[PDB]
Amino acid sequence: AAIIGLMVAKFXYK
Amino acid sequence: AAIIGLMVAKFXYK
Lengths: 14, 14
Description:
The structure is a homodimer. Chain A is mainly β. In chain A, 0% of the residues lie in helices and 36% in strands. Chain A is built from no helices and 1 strand. The chains hardly touch. It is classed as unknown function.
């Protein structure tokens, strides 16, 4: 597993 | 204190 982030500005594991 | 990230691509608190 690894850390996941999403950026839409606004920015948040699996 | 906050979570800080830097993006230069590659992407890492105080």
